[PDB]
């Protein structure tokens, strides 16, 4: 019974509760990368890169 | 019964509670990378890199 | 019964509670990398690098 | 300027986040009172009682 | 300027995050009172009682 | 400037994070009172009693 694998879980998020409460949020970039506020993110990859919250300035 | 593997878990997040409470958040980059506020992130990769909250300035 | 492996867990986070409470948070980079505020992050990788909260200035 | 009272707050709830996740919830009373699952409830009373999640068995 | 009282707060709840995660919750009373699961409740009373999560068996 | 009282706080709750995680919770009373799971509760009373999580068996 090759791979009779029952209920697995891979790359799962469940049961999250969040409260963000600012008064003056502010972002100001010049020529670069910015990544904020990522929340409750899942993923599964096969035979490939798997970045999630990446941020790169230049590439040459 | 090759790999009769029952309920595994791989790259799982569950049961998170968060309260962020600022008054003046502020981000200001010039030519670089910034990554903030990542929360409750899961992932599974097969045969590939697996960065999550990466940040790189340049590449040459 | 090769690998009759029952309920494993690999790269799991569960049951986190957090309260951040600032008054003036501030980030200001120039040409480099910054990574803040990472929380409740899981991952599993097979045959590849596995960075999570990386930060690199340059690459040449 | 008798009672130039500016922006007060009295009996206020704001900024709530909740995740309930059961599999078999069950309630079974016989002749009594039950009160469950109350959430995010505000109130203001003037010259009178102010119960919110009360529960009484008998009165004679 | 009698009572130039600025932004007061009285009976306030704000910024709550909750995750309940059961598998078999169960309640079973016989002739009495039960009060569960109260969350994020505010109140203000003037000239009167102020119970919130009360529970009484009998009254005679 | 009688009572120029600025931003007071009275009976305030703010910035709570909670994670409850059971597998079999159970409550079973017979003729009495039970009060569980109270969380993040505020109140202000003037000229009156102020119970919050009370529980009484009988009254005669
Ligand atoms: O049956 C799946 O194939 C396995 C993976 C895989 C792959 O990635 C690329 C490829 O060229 C071949 C390949 O054969 C794998 C395999 C798994 C076995 O259990 C098996 O008996 C077999 O003959 C051969 C499978 C299903 C999936 O759902 C999965 O996520 C996964 O990673 C794999
Ligand atoms: O059955 C899966 O294949 C295994 C992994 C794998 C792979 O990655 C690339 C590839 O060329 C071949 C490959 O054969 C693996 C394998 C596992 C066995 O238990 C097995 O009996 C077999 O013949 C051969 C599997 C399923 C998956 O779901 C999984 O996540 C995984 O990593 C693997
Ligand atoms: O069955 C899985 O294969 C094992 C891993 C693996 C791999 O990584 C690359 C590859 O070329 C082959 C490979 O064979 C492994 C293997 C495991 C065994 O128990 C087995 O009997 C076998 O013949 C051979 C497996 C499943 C998985 O879910 C997993 O996460 C894992 O790391 C592995
Ligand atoms: O102006 C409000 O009257 C106050 C309360 C009150 C009451 O409860 C019953 C009653 O017979 C009389 C009464 O006079 C109160 C009062 C407050 C003063 O500041 C004042 O100068 C005055 O002459 C007299 C008021 C407004 C409200 O919005 C309020 O919530 C409150 O509790 C009260
Ligand atoms: O102005 C408010 O009246 C005050 C309270 C109060 C009451 O409870 C019953 C009552 O017979 C009279 C009464 O006079 C109070 C009062 C407060 C003063 O600052 C004042 O100068 C005055 O003459 C007299 C007031 C407003 C409110 O919003 C409030 O919540 C409060 O408790 C009170
Ligand atoms: O102005 C408020 O009145 C005060 C309280 C109070 C009361 O409780 C019952 C009552 O018969 C009279 C009464 O006079 C109080 C009072 C406070 C003063 O600062 C004042 O100059 C005055 O003349 C007289 C007040 C406002 C409120 O918001 C409050 O919460 C409070 O407790 C009180």
Author numbering:
A (entry chain A), B (entry chain D), C (entry chain B), D (entry chain E), E (entry chain C), F (entry chain F): 37 to 96
Give excerpts from the publication.
We first selected EGCG, which was previously reported to bind and destabilize α‐syn fibril. Using surface plasmon resonance, we confirmed that EGCG binds to α‐syn fibril with the binding affinity (KD ) of 2.88 × 10−6 m. After helical reconstruction of datasets using RELION, we obtained a 3D density map of the α‐synEGCG fibril at resolutions of 3.1 Å. The overall architecture of the α‐synEGCG fibril is similar to that of the apo α‐syn fibril. Compared to the apo fibril, two extra densities alongside the fibril core were revealed. Remarkably, rather than binding the interface or pocket alongside the fibril core as commonly observed in the structures of α‐syn fibril in complexed with different chemical binders, EGCG inserts into a shallow and polar groove formed by residues 39–46 and 80–83, which is close to the N‐terminal of the α‐syn fibril core. Hydroxyl of the EGCG galloyl ring forms polar and hydrogen‐bond interaction with Lys80 and Tyr39 residues, while the hydroxyl from pyrogallol ring hydrogen bonds with Leu38, and hydroxyl from benzenediol ring hydrogen bonds with Glu83. Therefore, EGCG may interrupt the salt bridge between Glu46 and Lys80, which is pivotal for the stabilization of the Greek‐key‐like conformation in the apo α‐syn fibril. Furthermore, EGCG forms a hydrogen bond with the backbone amide of Tyr39, subsequently perturbing the interlayer hydrogen‐bond network within the fibril structure. Thus, insertion of EGCG into the polar groove may prise off the protofilament and destabilize the entire fibril structure.
Abnormal aggregation and fibrillation of α‐synuclein (α‐syn) are closely linked to the onset and progression of various neurodegenerative diseases (NDs) such as Parkinson's Disease (PD), Multiple System Atrophy (MSA) and Dementia with Lewy Bodies (DLB). α‐Syn fibril is also recognized as the key pathological hallmark of these diseases. Hence, targeting α‐syn fibrils is crucial for therapeutic interventions and early disease diagnosis. These fibrils are involved in a wide range of pathological processes, including cell‐to‐cell transmission, cellular membrane disruption through mechanical forces, and the triggering of neuroinflammation. Given the significant role of α‐syn fibrils in various NDs, extensive research has been conducted to develop chemicals for either binding to the fibrils for diagnosis or disrupting them for potential treatment. Moreover, we used cryo‐EM to explore structural alternations in α‐syn fibrils induced by two chemical compounds, EGCG and CCA, and correlated them to the potential mechanical changes.
